[PDB]
Design a protein around this ligand. Structure first.
Ligand code: ADP
Ligand code: ADP
Length: 719
């Protein structure tokens, strides 16, 4: 894919409340020309190369101007009012990030605190990052009540992994530079901690289960295994318990586990810290933790185990040490009075041998908070926090795709805006609605820090698809959001949905937008990846997926590229591997049919390549055809995507829509992208997209839809 880029003028961001937060201000036309949305990271290049998060510039900022704070100008090697190269950058989740600082901060600030303070932010080697933008007895009490422990010291990034540009994730490890010979070496990492029975917990079990109903099921599993083993023995069930908890990053998976195990003794390892250890020290750490949990019993908990036991991509299989690490865990699970719980944002990022009867026999998927749940979280985050008229309902309504981690960061930022307002007024800081709303202009949700992340796309980002949205809302959202009314009205349990249409028309895009609603756990796979890329049995991956969905209800099961997952008999010959998968799939689909809190949806560009047994009643029987965007639809798509692109008077998006027959939704989005770029390159100071700019763009952006293939898809439901 061609790497788009623009030279802009770099002006110093004069707003202190907008500076030193890892945010660069760009005109929307730049975002359009570069092919990115707000909150996407950009590469910034002067004499040096750095990266920052693209935030939309306020009014009064011409398209040819980028606003950079003092540290960004320094990191990019750009003088004020000088030229800067801006371009989209690939930002992977960091395995590790090594930072350097004073001997005092190196000894006083834990790696967990570092990760919390820098969560979601982009890092590049050589960069100067700030843990806190600003810095009295009432203000310090405020900072601590909101959870600000660290200070405002500027650090430097001495290393990242993988190389290039990375973002700090919950499964990342952020550790000090080890290390300057003069200064003392920093404390050891990757070793287990023990929390005794009935220990003081920051977040209670009651607090957790109001937005995470899955905590009730986890608690019930633990109690049966550890407290009432004769009940399970009477039924012939297994007394052992291994659980893999998954769900969006920072949604609160680890906090839920600690809350549920509050009355138990917990032996806890930090997956990333241990995973970063030298291979032999890594094994010893796991071994020490297993012997400790089996010495007295209780819960062995590994937060973010995907950093410790990565799934591997065949080019690199799992390391040999993983076999021995798994043997230790397996030994723990078989121990009476011992239970094993591990977390991971994406389950398939963990070694396949962990998702097995011998270690983790069952799984639990958490969900994004809906608007109601978000308001519950904000009120919880603001206990003992001096405030006025916060209007939390409005803040909750304006944070879709957010998680508690983000909301916490929103509140911390709000405390800074209050403390800044306080210092000028000399009054004691008191949070108002302005602070929280102002925080939203600088805080990037974790769901936007890396698509394919649940919450990155919302229905507003989807132009048009009125009829498709309508059908999906009624077929998927309505039954899940109203279980009892549907049952008492004698409405059938949610029918399986097959979503199909020509490429670049949003059949996948709209599902991802739909899946960001909240109060609904999403369990999604791409047909190709599960079959070809994943190390492990594909047939067991199917049963695993559905079992996690059943246990995490209300659940949506998204089988994208369903044609690859279940092709027609004869298309594949792999010693019966495909057969077992399809037969297992049919079996799972039939188990989902009577359920009311689980919906299954398959998507494909080629429905005729699916085994017809998938399309029988009780299975994927609701056929939703996604039409290519007509004249009406193209108007919406253009207007949605081109909303903030300044246009010249001789540009009419409506008449343009009528002329774009054969252009898919993606084609239209690309025509605006190309148009904006054509205008930016033509004249920076005369940025307004002209009719000629669009005319030139149409030379490179061609129609992609085949009228015969489109006809073939439309007739599919009747044939
Ligand atoms: N009820 C709560 N009150 C305050 N902070 C919370 C609460 N729940 C979660 N957090 C914070 O949000 C972040 C995300 O929680 P965590 O469980 O670590 O996410 P993950 O799902 O990635 O494990 C954590 O840093 C935690 O400190
Ligand atoms: N209605 C729409 N509005 C805006 N962008 C869209 C729309 N439909 C599709 N796209 C663009 O197309 C991309 C994916 O297209 P989609 O049709 O979902 O996949 P497929 O090619 O598998 O059908 C998305 O990243 C999105 O940018």
């Amino acid at each position: 894919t061609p790497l788009s880029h623009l030279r802009l003028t770099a002006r110093l961001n004069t707003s202190a409340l907008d500076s030193r937060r890892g945010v660069v201000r760009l005109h929307p036309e730049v975002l359009a020309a570069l092919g990115i949305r707000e909150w996407d990271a950009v590469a910034l290049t002067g004499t040096r190369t750095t990266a920052a998060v693209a935030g939309v510039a306020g009014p009064g900022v011409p398209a040819g101007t980028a606003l950079l704070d003092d540290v960004t100008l320094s990191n990019a090697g750009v003088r004020e009012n000088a030229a800067v190269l801006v371009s989209p950058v690939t930002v992977y989740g960091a395995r590790s990030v090594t930072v350097s600082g004073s001997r005092l901060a190196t000894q006083s600030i834990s790696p967990a605190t570092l990760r919390m303070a820098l969560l979601g932010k982009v890092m590049t080697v050589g960069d100067t990052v700030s843990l806190l933008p600003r810095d009295s007895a009432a203000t310090s009490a405020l900072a601590s009540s909101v959870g600000i422990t660290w200070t405002s010291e500027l650090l430097t990034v001495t290393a990242v992994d993988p190389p290039g540009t990375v973002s700090v994730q919950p499964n990342s490890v952020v550790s000090w530079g080890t290390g300057t010979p003069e200064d003392p070496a920093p404390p050891p990492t990757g070793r287990h901690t023990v929390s005794p029975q009935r220990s003081e917990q920051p977040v209670s079990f009651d607090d957790v289960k109001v937005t995470h109903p899955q905590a009730v099921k986890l608690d019930e599993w633990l109690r049966l295994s550890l407290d009432e083993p004769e009940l399970l023995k009477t039924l012939g069930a297994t007394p052992h318990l291994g659980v893999l908890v998954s769900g969006p990053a920072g949604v609160g998976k680890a906090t839920m586990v600690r809350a549920v195990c509050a009355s138990r003794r917990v032996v806890e390892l930090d997956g990333p810290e241990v995973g970063a250890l030298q291979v032999d020290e890594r094994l010893r750490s796991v071994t020490s933790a297993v012997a400790a949990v089996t010495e007295s019993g209780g819960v062995l908990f590994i937060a973010d185990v995907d950093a410790l036991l990565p799934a591997g991509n065949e080019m690199r299989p799992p390391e040999p040490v993983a076999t021995l690490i798994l043997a230790e865990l397996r030994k723990a699970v078989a121990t009476p009075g011992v239970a094993f719980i591990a977390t991971s944002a994406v389950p398939e990022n963990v070694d396949a041998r962990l998702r097995a009867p011998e270690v983790c026999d069952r799984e639990l998927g958490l969900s994004l908070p809906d608007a109601t749940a978000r308001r519950s979280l904000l009120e919880m985050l603001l206990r003992g926090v001096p405030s006025e008229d916060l209007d939390l309902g409005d803040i909750a309504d304006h944070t879709p795709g957010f998680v508690v981690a983000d909301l916490a960061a929103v509140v911390r930022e709000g405390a800074l805006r209050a403390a800044a307002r306080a210092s000028s007024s000399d009054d004691d800081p008191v949070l108002r609605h302005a602070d929280l709303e102002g925080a939203l202009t600088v805080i990037r949700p974790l769901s936007r820090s890396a698509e394919v992340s649940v919450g990155s796309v919302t229905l507003d980002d989807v132009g048009d698809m009125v009829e498709t949205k309508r059908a999906l809302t009624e077929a998927v959202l309505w039954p899940l959001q109203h279980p009892d009314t549907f049952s008492r009205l004698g409405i059938d349990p949610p029918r399986g949905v097959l979503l199909y249409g020509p490429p670049g028309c949003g059949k996948t895009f709209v599902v991802r937008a739909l899946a960001s609603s909240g109060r609904l756990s999403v369990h999604a796979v791409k047909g190709s990846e599960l079959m070809d890329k994943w190390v492990g049995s594909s047939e067991k991956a199917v049963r695993e997926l559905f079992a996690r969905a059943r246990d995490s209800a209300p659940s949506l099961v998204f089988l994208d590229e369903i044609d690859a997952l279940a092709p027609r008999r004869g298309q594949n010959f792999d010693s019966g591997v495909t057969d077992k998968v399809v037969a297992s799939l049919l079996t799972e689909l039939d188990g989902i049919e009577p359920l009311r809190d689980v919906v299954v949806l398959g998507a494909t560009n080629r429905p005729d390549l699916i085994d017809p047994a998938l399309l029988r009643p009780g299975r994927l029987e609701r056929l939703v055809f996604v039409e290519p965007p007509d004249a009406a639809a193209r108007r919406d798509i253009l207007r949605t995507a081109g909303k903030s692109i300044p246009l010249a008077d001789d540009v009419d998006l409506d008449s343009l829509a009528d002329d774009l027959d054969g252009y898919s939704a993606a084609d239209c989005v690309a025509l605006l992208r190309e148009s904006a770029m054509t205008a930016m390159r033509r004249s920076i100071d005369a940025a307004d997209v002209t009719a000629a700019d669009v005319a030139k763009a149409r030379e490179t952006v061609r129609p992609s839809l085949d009228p015969a293939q489109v006809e073939s898809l439309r007739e599919f439901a009747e044939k």
